């Protein structure tokens, strides 16, 4: 296999505005097919990238900054990855739309799956409204990320390389003196399988496919043979013996990571999807499902000269392989200090979500299930409703709801809601067989409150097998048409995604 830790970790450049004033910031981003070397020992790989880069440029904004991005498609008219034509029924083959994950965004700038567009906006989807997306950024400082969200193509377009980081800076958090600038580094983790000739491999079908299956055929899961960080296979990063802030983003299709340091050292988590935690949390390891973000501090002060592996213990379609997928990246504490470490690791970070005392307008019971198609494939469904079925999740603007998510399947699903960040209330185990046979919910244990990592704000949440997960969300400030879905992209595309109408009565 490819030799680990021979390439330096790239740090995506920060995107510069095309136009900027006090009143408005204007960006242009063009999707392009490009080649990049993903590892020292590989030929260059054909990829799809925002501004021709993989990952895309990091976008940095202030809270309340009036930001516009014209996302443009200048991609080839044919895909290089295998499209399954049977999962969705004169349309172009290549459709794209950019979703700012975690964005508090007006609905027509949110990247609705059916607001897609082909090259130069020549053809557009039925929900398309506008070329230039509007991000008012009227929300907490947080790690966001942007990726393709096109109907029935999300798993392919994202795997092709259409991902990037988007950071909201709240000037009020500057007094905390968290590590910043060069010492504040996004880590976008993507697992990939790469052929000897350097080309990306994505399966055309399940292994030993049933003759009943079409070709190509969507697969229920994808597990890459290699791990990349910031577009490089198993890279190393030279760090100062100093505190660093890392914005950890799982940008993988299916794979969940469970991260630790091979020297037994700790992380300090300061933030989740929705921004700073109320209190910092000392951690030895953490689980990171697709689309989850961890804002963490690693203190290298006492580890000068050392090589430390960011390790992974979570398997994907089997046990983790010590020589491959058990490795993420390597820190080398060999960079001379550029200046005094004046950064801090404060305990008191932000207001508790529990300070809020909103009235519960509605309690929604939702089940994770599905059916089988004419080809024998599993079709994963939220409430046994297809994407095209009439909308059922219709919260009222400005109201708070508790969503109770029932998972009677054998796997964890990272459930994601657009627009909002939410509070985690609790998880509680139930009798699966009883539920499957009768629909009766019979608990096999008491409710478990969230760990300290989930006491802040979340937008993507692990719904474990055989449990009921309860979350609470205030739906707003905008009304309109959004979505909610599992962020395992192979599930999202077929067909574990539903519309979500926030109404203004």
Residues at the site binding Cu ion, with contacts judged by CB under 5 A:
101, 291, 413, 418, 486, 488, 491
**Least distance between Cu ion and beta carbon 498 (Å):** 11
Of 401 and 493, which has the nearer Cβ to Cu ion?
Answer: 493
Q: What angle do CA 472, 474, 477 make, to 5 degrees?
A: 160
DSSP states of 29-40? EEEEEEEE-SST
Residue 199 neighbours by CB distance under 10 Å: 15
**Least distance between Cu ion and beta carbon 414 (Å):** 7
DSSP states of 419-453? S--BEEEEEEEB-HHHHHHH----BSS--BPPPGG
d(CA 165, CA 479): 26
Of 268 and 486, which has the nearer Cβ to Cu ion?
Answer: 486
Nearest position to Cu ion, beta carbon: 486
Q: End-to-end CA distance of the chain, in Å?
A: 59
**Least distance between Cu ion and beta carbon 180 (Å):** 26
Q: Which residues define the annotated binding site for Cu cation?
A: 99, 101, 147, 149, 413, 416, 418, 485-487, 491, 496
Residue 298 belongs to what H/E stretch?
strand 293-299
**Least distance between Cu ion and beta carbon 257 (Å):** 16
Of 255 and 491, which has the nearer Cβ to Cu ion?
Answer: 491
Of 73 and 462, which has the nearer Cβ to Cu ion?
Answer: 462
Of 243 and 491, which has the nearer Cβ to Cu ion?
Answer: 491
Structure tokens at 82: 């295998």
**Least distance between Cu ion and beta carbon 92 (Å):** 21
**Least distance between Cu ion and beta carbon 166 (Å):** 11
Cα 261–chain centre separation: 22
**489 three-class SS:** helix
Q: Which residues define the annotated binding site?
A: 99, 101, 147, 149, 413, 416, 418, 485-487, 491, 496
Of 37 and 412, which has the nearer Cβ to Cu ion?
Answer: 412
Q: Cα–Cα distances in Å, from 487 out to 64, 117, 256?
A: 27, 22, 11
Strands 184-194 and 226-229: antiparallel
Residue 255: closest CA among 310, 163, 190, 299: 190
**Least distance between Cu ion and beta carbon 409 (Å):** 8
Q: How many residues does the chain have?
A: 505
**Least distance between Cu ion and beta carbon 418 (Å):** 5
Q: Cα–Cα distances in Å, from 386 out to 203, 288, 370, 418, 496?
A: 24, 28, 9, 18, 8
Contact 102, 273 (CB under 8 A): yes
DSSP states of 184-241? EEEEEEEEEEE-TTSPEE--SS-SS--TTS-SS---S----SEEEETTEES-EEE--S
Of 102 and 450, which has the nearer Cβ to Cu ion?
Answer: 102
């Amino acid at each position: 296999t490819l030799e680990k830790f021979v390439d330096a970790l790239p740090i995506p450049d920060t995107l510069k505005p095309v136009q900027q004033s006090k009143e408005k910031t204007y960006y242009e981003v063009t999707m392009e097919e490009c080649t990049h070397q993903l590892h020292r020992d590989l030929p260059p790989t054909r990829l799809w990238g925002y501004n021709g880069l993989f990952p895309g440029p990091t976008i940095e904004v202030k809270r309340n900054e009036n930001v516009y991005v014209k996302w443009m498609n200048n991609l080839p008219s044919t895909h290089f990855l295998p499209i399954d034509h049977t999962i969705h029924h004169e349309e172009p083959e290549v459709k794209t739309v950019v979703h700012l994950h975690g964005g508090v965004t007006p609905d027509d700038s949110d990247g609705y799956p059916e607001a897609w567009f082909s090259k130069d906006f020549e053809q557009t989807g039925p929900y398309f409204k506008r070329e230039v997306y509007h991000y008012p950024n009227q929300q907490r400082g947080a790690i966001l990320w942007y990726h393709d969200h096109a109907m029935a193509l999300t798993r392919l377009n994202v795997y092709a390389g259409l991902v990037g980081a988007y950071i909201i800076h709240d000037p009020k958090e500057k007094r905390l003196k968290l590590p910043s600038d060069e010492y504040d580094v996004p880590l976008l983790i993507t697992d990939r399988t790469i052929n000897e000739d350097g080309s990306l491999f994505y399966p055309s079908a399940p292994e030993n496919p049933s003759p009943s299956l079409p070709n190509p055929s969507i697969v229920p899961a994808f597990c890459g043979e290699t791990i990349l960080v910031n577009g490089k296979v198993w890279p190393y990063l030279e760090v100062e013996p100093r505190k660093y802030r890392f914005r950890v983003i799982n940008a993988s299709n299916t794979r969940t990571y469970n991260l630790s340091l091979d020297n037994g050292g700790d992380f300090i988590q300061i933030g989740s999807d929705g921004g700073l935690l109320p209190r910092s949390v000392k951690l030895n390891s953490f689980s990171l499902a697709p689309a989850e973000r961890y804002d963490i501090i690693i203190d290298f002060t006492a580890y000068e000269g050392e090589s430390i592996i960011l390790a992974n213990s979570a398997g994907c379609g089997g046990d983790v392989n010590p020589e491959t997928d058990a490795n993420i990246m390597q820190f080398r504490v060999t960079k001379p200090l550029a200046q005094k470490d004046e950064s801090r690791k404060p305990k008191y970070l932000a207001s508790y979500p529990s300070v809020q005392h909103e009235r519960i307008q509605n309690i929604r019971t939702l089940k994770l299930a599905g059916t089988q198609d004419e080809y024998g494939r599993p079709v994963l469904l939220l409430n046994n409703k297809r994407w095209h079925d009439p909308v059922t999740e219709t919260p009222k603007v400005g109201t708070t709801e508790i969503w109770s998510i029932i998972n009677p399947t054998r796997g964890t699903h990272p459930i994601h809601l657009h627009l909002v960040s939410f509070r985690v209330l609790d998880r509680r185990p139930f009798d699966i067989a009883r539920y499957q046979e009768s629909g009766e919910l019979s608990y096999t244990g008491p409710a478990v409150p969230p760990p300290p990592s989930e006491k802040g704000w979340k937008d993507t949440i692990q719904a474990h097998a055989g449990e009921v997960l309860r979350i609470a969300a205030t739906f707003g400030p905008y009304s309109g048409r959004y979505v909610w879905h599992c962020h395992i992209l192979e599930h999202d595309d077929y067909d574990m995604m539903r519309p979500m109408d926030i109404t203004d009565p």
